[PDB]
Design a protein around this ligand. Structure first.
Ligand SMILES: Cc1cc2nc3c(=O)[nH]c(=O)nc-3n(C[C@H](O)[C@H](O)[C@H](O)COP(=O)(O)O)c2cc1C
Ligand code: SF4
Ligand code: SF4
Ligand code: SF4
Ligand code: SF4
Ligand code: SF4
Ligand code: SF4
Ligand code: SF4
Ligand code: FES
Ligand code: FES
Ligand SMILES: [Zn+2]
Lengths: 583, 129, 470
């Protein structure tokens, strides 16, 4: 490690080799504007915002990608720098459609914050913006080309982080635009509905498919009763919308606010989640005792199973036949609650507040229906629920707390930890150990693989006669790596591999509220969300295990008999088919 | 002049891939070589070549579009390129451009429906003397 | 023919250097020669050799590259030495590889030069037949290898970092500096980039000494420089003259004067990256420091001369049309500013502009000059800034008076017939598409300027040439 000495603006510093002047000034309490810069993701120098005077330099240099050097002098407040920033913002703003009353981003468009910050009132230079081509055809992602700034963040994210890379650049000059391949639509190619591309864009050129009109139409029907259900991870970040500090639980406030909307029933996805935990435990027991297809993987997140269908069909024996916890609880409410309440199943409308955006495509699937009836009707993301609350506009900061409904709102901590990565797998191994060997484990040690961060390996003795190999995976690149190893066959001994496309778990999902870059250089939002969720876990004083909850025991005794029954297979078990690829 | 290979014949494409796989930075070279053999390169050629390489279509399609000298649509029998160089410009080349537009009955950058005449704005061929 | 070059004291530089001269001594000789690159960057050549030599690579692998990708209109010297004598070309990089310790090099040529590409590979075969290319070069321990890379004439690829990615197979998109390609270049390894013309005099430096190269020329730049002379000139070709020759001599003593006795008005240097040199600077010493003080540079070495008959408004548009076409397109200046440059000008050509737009031009021109990443866009307004500095009053004719004195701006000129010569045959009336020409036979006709679109079909339709541009 080499030590570099540099002198800026009255202060000298020693830094390691590879240091950039930007985060060096950040550490030394100086801020420089950023558009195209992301920490360790997009470092190319296309933004052309961050100019600083360099001693001995013919012209200005961009501080974003500028490596430090020894003995240099840097001054950041010359008149040339200010004039260059003003003129360059005037140039770049002549393309972005200036009707900022109606952008979804609106208040936190980083371009708008820069525009106000530089105080550049006038725009002397006119122009002819590029062609307006609204791609309002796909299922989840909507693109608008009248806004895009060629920041290149979206393409870098979809190339590196997700290892999919269905976006590229075409043309030259004004003809240069970001497009999918073959001039098709997003849904016509192998897009995974990752949600990272829509969350990382600093302008609002991308938006999600809005179904709030359908929601208002559904709630407007007196003949239709509404069943709303909640994720464990909605209270992980929603408080950030209302100016609350990171890590606030508003669960009772959320229930009260949803009741003020006039929803007939409020409920949690937790109960069916415990049901499917019992499920995967049951076919674990079966595949152990019958030599089932191994290694086993879950079927929780729609995104990566979509990826497996699209790209690697050869692992289709390895998937779990179970349907998603969303799908489990949706079918459960549409059947058992309907039987108890003696109401026509078409007379219920079920709405879900989930953070994945891939569920928008997942609900559109033909085969996720029971008895020809829709298990769930409308799925919505956290951001658009927030805007629904804002258009209703109840002062959220003074709500009291409320409880959930019988029976399917009850909670357990091992099912609270669904929000973080591997909590599903933790609950599964804890429950199967409790069932088979009466073993009381709370946490599992994880082996961090050298050179790859985000992949986690574990192996704990479930029974003295059977030690189960455990692998955790989040991040599309990690999925690609572990799938390549699985095709190579070196994971033959492995038993469970848990996968989601979105890195860091659902707290880092596509439906989570938008955050800027500044807080990302400060604090990992994943870390604070995980701490808040784990603190919520430690406070669950009713049950830390799913199989001990009296509600799931009641349902199993009365209506579900045992898992892997013919009724259980017919209602909760499904098959998947490979999808045609257009790549 | 060797006959252009029909674009539906894909064994030649993968033969080219196999013989020039080992070469570093082979994308541009293979692209221009298939341009030479096939005459024009439709979209399924990017699809097939990227499937053989196993690397996504985005960069291949981009470098196909980023080089203006690479063609995606069928052209005419004869291409007419008029020198838009400065030495040709100062002589008054716009008069020649308008005369070509008048006689050809076709605008700049379009191929005649007969598939015989095409016009291009080559900036220089180098014979500025 | 390999026997021809060896009969003209060829390939003797490697014979001397591989046996007597150390790699460090070669850098000393070129530094003692005062050689500085003519590629446009204005960097001293021998100084570049230091940075590659002392830098340390992980695997002990270094690379060299040869830049033959000329794209300047009217500039053809780069191929000419290649198609004239590639044996001298390939000899140069052999000395370069010894000085740096690079065992393999790459040569980049456009594919639209079939005579150039075919000639070089024959020389590659002849060299490797005699043993020059390959291993144990001239019974020494030095082994050097070359590979041909076929470029496709992308002008933006002529940048230092830009061509590196083209060899790497990715998009020809420029990279910010630092790091310099001498430190982190091809495959992240130290690399040396030099154009063919500066490679040409390298054997003469070793064979005839640095003082001989120093014995001609001025102190800041020594030797001679070649240009592809062109434009409004009676005689076209190439000239090999030392720097400091005044601009008046090359037009008159060497060029023979303006063709047809026209009046010289302005001269283009450095192609689309340069500017206009009028009659006020016919006595300017042509070298590095004077021309950059006059707002231009050598570029690739293009010289175009203009006469009285050319309206400088249109040529300013014409050079600007180049920059908009060849933009790579990352930075907002070279992407958006070019049409911002453009959109003002044709309204001036069509008379749709208003007053004060000339000041608006200079406001953004200085801004993008200081804020362009790619080297092309930073030199984009230099032709425009050259015109406004000395030919400001021509625009006042167009913006205010709405006339083109050169009769070039089509939407601003008018047509008048010569009534004393016009027979009044009415053929122009038959050839007027907008029905602007009226009159009677044997009498000169009358024309409504407001009717015709000023297409100009009438002026050539006159058998006596009586229609004049007004
Ligand atoms: C856009 C662009 C195009 C260029 N084209 C050429 C060219 O065609 N021929 C050439 O010799 N140099 C060109 N250069 C300059 C080269 O970058 C490089 O400077 C030259 O090879 C080295 O000579 P130097 O020592 O003067 O830099 C170009 C630079 C830029 C930015
Ligand atoms: S970029 Fe979009 S959100 Fe930001 S100010 Fe412009 S229109 Fe509004
Ligand atoms: S969506 Fe538009 S502005 Fe955002 S990163 Fe992609 S190209 Fe840039
Ligand atoms: S949803 Fe995923 S695959 Fe589709 S563009 Fe966004 S990041 Fe890429
Ligand atoms: S992290 Fe959450 S949103 Fe992302 S794929 Fe997994 S379950 Fe879906
Ligand atoms: S000047 Fe700017 S826009 Fe033009 S090629 Fe260079 S970086 Fe790209
Ligand atoms: S310029 Fe054309 S339209 Fe006008 S009078 Fe002459 S022939 Fe007719
Ligand atoms: S200008 Fe020429 S064509 Fe027209 S009437 Fe006179 S002589 Fe005839
Ligand atoms: S913000 Fe510095 S180059 Fe992008
Ligand atoms: S000047 Fe004639 S082709 Fe360039
Ligand atoms: Zn004019």
């Amino acid at each position: 490690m080499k030590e570099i000495t540099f002198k800026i603006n009255g202060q000298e510093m020693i830094v390691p080799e590879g240091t950039t002047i930007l985060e060096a000034a950040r550490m030394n309490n100086i801020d420089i504007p950023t558009l195209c810069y992301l920490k360790d993701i997009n470092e190319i120098g296309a933004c052309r915002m961050c100019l600083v005077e360099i001693a001995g330099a013919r012209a200005l240099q961009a501080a974003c990608v500028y490596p430090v050097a020894n003995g240099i002098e840097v001054l950041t407040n010359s008149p040339k720098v200010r004039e260059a920033r003003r003129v360059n913002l005037e140039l770049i703003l002549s393309n972005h459609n200036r009707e900022c009353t109606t952008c979804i981003r609106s208040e936190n468009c980083e371009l708008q914050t820069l525009a106000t910050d530089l105080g550049v009132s006038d725009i002397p230079f006119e122009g002819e913006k590029s062609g307006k081509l609204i791609d309002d055809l796909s299922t989840s992602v909507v693109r608008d080309e009248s806004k895009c700034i060629l920041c290149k963040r979206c393409v870098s994210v979809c190339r590196d982080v997700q290892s999919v890379a269905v976006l590229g650049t075409v043309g030259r000059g004004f003809t240069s635009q970001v497009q999918p391949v073959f001039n098709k639509s997003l849904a016509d190619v192998g897009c995974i509905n990752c949600g990272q591309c829509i969350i990382n864009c600093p302008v609002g050129a991308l938006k999600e498919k809005s179904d709030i009109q359908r929601v208002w139409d559904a709630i407007a029907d007196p003949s239709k009763t509404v069943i709303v259900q909640t994720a464990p991870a909605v209270r992980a970040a929603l408080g950030e919308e209302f100016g609350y500090p990171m890590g606030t639980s508003v669960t009772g406030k959320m229930a009260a606010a949803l009741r003020r909307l006039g929803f007939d029933k409020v409920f949690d996805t937790d109960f069916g989640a415990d049901v499917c935990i019992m499920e995967e435990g049951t076919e674990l027991i079966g595949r152990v005792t019958n030599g089932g297809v191994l290694p086993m993987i879950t079927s929780c997140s729609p995104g990566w199973i979509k990826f497996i269908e699209t790209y690697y069909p050869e692992a289709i024996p390895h998937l779990s036949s179970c349907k998603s916890p969303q799908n489990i609880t949706g079918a459960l409410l549409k059947n058992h609650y309907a039987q108890t309440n003696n109401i026509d199943p078409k007379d219920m409308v079920v709405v879900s507040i989930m953070p994945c955006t891939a569920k928008k495509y997942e609900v559109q699937r033909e085969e996720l229906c029971t008895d020809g009836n829709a298990d769930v009707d409308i799925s919505i993301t956290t951001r658009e629920l927030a805007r629904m609350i804002k258009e209703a506009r109840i002062l959220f900061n003074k709500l009291p707390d409320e409880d959930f409904d019988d029976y399917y709102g009850e909670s357990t901590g091992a099912a609270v930890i669904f929000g973080a990565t591997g909590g599903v797998m933790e609950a599964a191994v804890r429950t199967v150990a409790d069932v088979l060997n009466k073993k009381d484990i709370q946490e599992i040690d994880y082996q961090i693989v050298r050179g790859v961060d985000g992949i986690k390996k574990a192996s704990v003795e479930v029974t003295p006669d059977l030690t189960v190999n455990l692998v955790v995976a989040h991040g599309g690149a990690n999925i690609r790596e572990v799938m390549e190893q699985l095709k190579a066959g070196e994971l033959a001994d492995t038993h469970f591999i848990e996968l989601m496309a979105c890195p860091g778990g659902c707290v880092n999902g596509g439906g989570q509220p938008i955050v800027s870059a500044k807080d990302k250089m400060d604090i990992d939002i994943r870390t604070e969300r995980a701490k808040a969720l784990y603190d919520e876990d430690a406070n669950v004083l009713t049950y830390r295990k799913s199989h001990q909850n009296p509600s799931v025991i009641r349902l199993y005794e009365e209506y579900l008999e045992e898992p892997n029954s013919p009724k259980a297979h017919h209602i909760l078990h499904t098959k998947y088919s490979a999808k045609p690829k257009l790549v | 002049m060797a006959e252009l290979i029909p674009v539906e014949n894909l064994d030649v494409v993968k033969a080219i891939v196999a013989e020039h796989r080992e070469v570093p930075g082979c994308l541009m070279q293979i692209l221009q070589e298939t341009q030479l053999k096939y005459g024009y390169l439709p979209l399924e050629l990017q699809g097939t070549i990227a499937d053989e390489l196993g690397i996504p279509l985005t960069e291949v399609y981009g470098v196909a579009t980023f080089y203006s000298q690479f063609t995606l649509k069928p052209k005419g029998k004869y291409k007419i390129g008029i020198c838009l160089g400065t030495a040709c410009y100062v002589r008054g080349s716009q008069a020649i451009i308008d005369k070509v537009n008048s006689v050809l009955g076709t605008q700049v950058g379009d191929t005649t429906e007969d598939g015989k005449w095409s016009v291009d704005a080559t900036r220089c061929v180098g014979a500025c003397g | 023919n390999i026997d021809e070059y060896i009969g003209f004291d060829g390939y003797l530089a490697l014979e001397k250097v591989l046996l007597t001269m150390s790699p460090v001594d070669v850098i000393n000789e070129v530094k003692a020669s005062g050689l500085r690159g003519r590629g446009g960057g204005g960097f001293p050549t021998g100084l570049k050799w230091q940075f590659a030599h002392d830098a340390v690579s992980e695997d002990g692998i270094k690379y060299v590259a040869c830049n033959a990708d000329e794209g300047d209109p009217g500039a053809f010297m780069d191929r000419s030495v290649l198609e004239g004598d590639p044996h001298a070309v390939i000899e140069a990089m052999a000395i370069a590889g010894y000085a740096v310790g690079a065992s393999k090099g790459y040569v980049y040529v456009r594919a639209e030069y079939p005579i150039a590409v075919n000639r070089l590979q024959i020389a590659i075969d002849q060299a490797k037949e005699y043993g020059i290319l390959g291993e144990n070069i001239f019974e020494t321990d030095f082994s050097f290898d070359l590979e041909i890379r076929l470029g496709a004439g992308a002008f933006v690829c002529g940048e230092e970092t830009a061509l590196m990615n083209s060899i790497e197979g990715k998009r020809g998109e420029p990279r910010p500096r630092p790091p310099f390609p001498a430190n982190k270049g091809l495959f992240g390894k130290p690399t040396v980039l030099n154009n063919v013309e500066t490679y040409a005099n390298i054997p003469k430096i070793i064979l005839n000494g640095a003082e001989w190269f120093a014995s001609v020329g001025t102190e800041k730049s020594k030797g001679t420089k070649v240009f592809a002379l062109g434009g409004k000139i009676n005689n076209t070709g190439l000239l090999e003259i030392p720097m400091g020759t005044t601009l008046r001599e090359i037009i008159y003593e060497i060029g023979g004067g303006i063709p047809n006795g026209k009046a010289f008005k302005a001269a283009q240097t450095g192609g689309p990256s340069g500017g206009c040199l009028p009659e006020s600077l016919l006595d300017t010493e042509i070298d590095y420091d004077n021309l950059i003080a006059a707002g231009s540079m050598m570029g690739s070495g293009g010289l175009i001369v203009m006469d009285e008959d050319n309206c400088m408004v249109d040529v300013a548009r014409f050079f600007l049309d180049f920059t908009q076409d060849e933009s790579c397109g990352k930075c907002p200046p070279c992407r958006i500013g070019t049409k911002r440059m453009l959109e003002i000008l044709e309204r001036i050509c069509d008379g749709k502009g208003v007053e004060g737009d000339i000041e608006r031009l200079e406001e953004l021109a200085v801004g993008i000059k200081s804020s362009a990443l790619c080297g092309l866009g930073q030199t984009a307004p230099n032709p425009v800034l050259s015109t406004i500095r000395f030919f400001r009053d021509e625009y006042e004719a167009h913006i205010r008076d709405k006339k083109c004195p050169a009769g070039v701006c089509k939407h601003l000129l008018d047509f008048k017939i010569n009534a004393d010569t016009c027979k009044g045959c009415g053929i122009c009336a038959k050839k007027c598409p907008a029905d602007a020409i009226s009159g009677e036979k044997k009498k000169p006709y009358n024309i409504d300027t407001s009717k015709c679109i000023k297409c100009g079909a009438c002026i050539e339709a006159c058998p006596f040439g009586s229609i004049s541009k007004a």
